[PDB]
Amino acid sequence: KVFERCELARTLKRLGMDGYRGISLANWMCLAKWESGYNTRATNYNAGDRSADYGIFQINSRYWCNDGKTPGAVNACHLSCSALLQDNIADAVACAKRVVRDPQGIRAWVAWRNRCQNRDVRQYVQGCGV
Numbered sequence: 001k002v003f004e005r006c007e008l009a010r011t012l013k014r015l016g017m018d019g020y021r022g023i024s025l026a027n028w029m030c031l032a033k034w035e036s037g038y039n040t041r042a043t044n045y046n047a048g049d050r051s052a053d054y055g056i057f058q059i060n061s062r063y064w065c066n067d068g069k070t071p072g073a074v075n076a077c078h079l080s081c082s083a084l085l086q087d088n089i090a091d092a093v094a095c096a097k098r099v100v101r102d103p104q105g106i107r108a109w110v111a112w113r114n115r116c117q118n119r120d121v122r123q124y125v126q127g128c129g130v
Protein backbone atom coordinates (compact mmCIF):
# COMPACT_ATOMS: atom_id res chain seq x y z
CA LYS A 1 0.00 0.00 0.00
CA VAL A 2 1.24 3.50 -0.82
CA PHE A 3 -0.33 5.86 1.74
CA GLU A 4 -1.31 9.41 0.89
CA ARG A 5 0.29 11.98 3.26
CA CYS A 6 -2.57 12.98 5.56
CA GLU A 7 -4.02 9.44 5.45
CA LEU A 8 -0.81 8.17 7.03
CA ALA A 9 -0.54 11.03 9.54
CA ARG A 10 -3.93 10.10 10.99
CA THR A 11 -3.14 6.36 10.91
CA LEU A 12 0.10 6.90 12.85
CA LYS A 13 -1.73 9.13 15.35
CA ARG A 14 -4.37 6.44 15.98
CA LEU A 15 -1.58 3.89 16.59
CA GLY A 16 -0.16 6.09 19.36
CA MET A 17 2.91 7.55 17.67
CA ASP A 18 2.28 11.22 18.43
CA GLY A 19 4.95 12.08 20.98
CA TYR A 20 5.97 8.45 21.52
CA ARG A 21 9.15 8.72 23.61
CA GLY A 22 9.28 12.43 22.74
CA ILE A 23 9.06 11.95 18.97
CA SER A 24 6.50 14.16 17.24
CA LEU A 25 4.22 13.01 14.45
CA ALA A 26 5.94 15.24 11.84
CA ASN A 27 9.20 13.40 12.63
CA TRP A 28 7.68 9.94 11.95
CA MET A 29 6.12 11.26 8.71
CA CYS A 30 9.48 12.67 7.55
CA LEU A 31 11.06 9.28 8.38
CA ALA A 32 8.40 7.24 6.48
CA LYS A 33 8.48 9.71 3.58
CA TRP A 34 12.24 9.51 3.14
CA GLU A 35 12.53 5.77 3.93
CA SER A 36 9.93 4.41 1.48
CA GLY A 37 7.78 7.23 0.10
CA TYR A 38 4.95 5.92 2.33
CA ASN A 39 5.13 2.47 0.65
CA THR A 40 4.48 -0.51 2.96
CA ARG A 41 5.81 -3.15 0.55
CA ALA A 42 9.09 -1.31 -0.05
CA THR A 43 12.19 -3.54 0.35
CA ASN A 44 15.93 -3.13 0.01
CA TYR A 45 18.63 -5.78 -0.01
CA ASN A 46 22.02 -4.83 1.41
CA ALA A 47 24.44 -7.04 -0.54
CA GLY A 48 27.22 -5.75 1.72
CA ASP A 49 26.12 -7.40 4.97
CA ARG A 50 23.40 -9.75 3.72
CA SER A 51 20.57 -8.01 5.59
CA ALA A 52 17.40 -6.48 4.20
CA ASP A 53 15.19 -3.46 4.95
CA TYR A 54 11.42 -3.98 5.20
CA GLY A 55 8.36 -1.79 4.89
CA ILE A 56 7.28 1.78 5.35
CA PHE A 57 10.10 2.44 7.88
CA GLN A 58 12.61 0.14 6.14
CA ILE A 59 13.39 -1.79 9.31
CA ASN A 60 16.49 -4.03 9.12
CA SER A 61 16.62 -7.83 9.56
CA ARG A 62 19.92 -7.97 11.46
CA TYR A 63 18.43 -6.75 14.73
CA TRP A 64 14.67 -6.26 14.47
CA CYS A 65 12.82 -8.92 12.50
CA ASN A 66 13.52 -12.48 11.38
CA ASP A 67 13.79 -13.38 7.66
CA GLY A 68 15.76 -16.60 8.18
CA LYS A 69 18.60 -15.63 5.81
CA THR A 70 20.57 -12.93 7.67
CA PRO A 71 23.78 -14.32 9.32
CA GLY A 72 23.78 -14.24 13.13
CA ALA A 73 20.83 -11.86 13.19
CA VAL A 74 18.46 -11.37 16.07
CA ASN A 75 14.69 -10.60 16.27
CA ALA A 76 14.13 -7.85 18.88
CA CYS A 77 10.62 -7.09 17.61
CA HIS A 78 9.85 -10.83 17.77
CA LEU A 79 8.27 -10.74 14.28
CA SER A 80 8.80 -12.36 10.88
CA CYS A 81 9.96 -9.60 8.54
CA SER A 82 6.87 -10.55 6.46
CA ALA A 83 4.75 -8.77 9.15
CA LEU A 84 6.51 -5.55 8.09
CA LEU A 85 5.21 -5.88 4.49
CA GLN A 86 1.46 -5.82 5.27
CA ASP A 87 -0.92 -3.04 4.17
CA ASN A 88 -1.89 -2.80 7.85
CA ILE A 89 0.96 -1.04 9.62
CA ALA A 90 0.10 -2.00 13.22
CA ASP A 91 3.01 -4.45 13.52
CA ALA A 92 5.47 -2.10 11.80
CA VAL A 93 4.46 0.63 14.29
CA ALA A 94 4.97 -1.70 17.30
CA CYS A 95 8.40 -2.58 15.99
CA ALA A 96 9.23 1.08 15.22
CA LYS A 97 8.37 1.88 18.88
CA ARG A 98 10.61 -1.01 19.98
CA VAL A 99 13.44 0.50 17.88
CA VAL A 100 13.17 3.91 19.53
CA ARG A 101 13.02 2.36 23.01
CA ASP A 102 16.80 1.89 22.57
CA PRO A 103 19.38 4.63 23.48
CA GLN A 104 19.50 6.26 20.01
CA GLY A 105 15.81 7.02 19.83
CA ILE A 106 14.68 8.32 16.41
CA ARG A 107 18.36 8.65 15.45
CA ALA A 108 18.34 4.87 14.86
CA TRP A 109 17.54 5.67 11.20
CA VAL A 110 20.33 7.39 9.25
CA ALA A 111 17.83 8.86 6.78
CA TRP A 112 16.17 10.69 9.70
CA ARG A 113 19.51 12.30 10.60
CA ASN A 114 20.13 13.14 6.92
CA ARG A 115 16.74 14.60 5.96
CA CYS A 116 14.72 15.32 9.13
CA GLN A 117 17.03 16.25 12.01
CA ASN A 118 17.32 20.01 12.57
CA ARG A 119 14.96 20.62 9.67
CA ASP A 120 11.52 22.22 9.31
CA VAL A 121 9.30 19.11 9.30
CA ARG A 122 6.08 21.03 10.00
CA GLN A 123 5.15 20.73 6.36
CA TYR A 124 4.61 16.96 6.72
CA VAL A 125 1.50 17.17 8.93
CA GLN A 126 0.01 20.45 7.70
CA GLY A 127 -3.63 20.25 6.76
CA CYS A 128 -3.96 16.68 8.06
CA GLY A 129 -6.07 17.39 11.13
CA VAL A 130 -3.56 15.91 13.57
Ligand code: NA
Nearest residue numbers: 061065073074
Ligand atom coordinates in the same frame (compact mmCIF):
# COMPACT_ATOMS: atom_id res chain seq x y z
NA1 NA B 1 16.74 -10.86 12.18
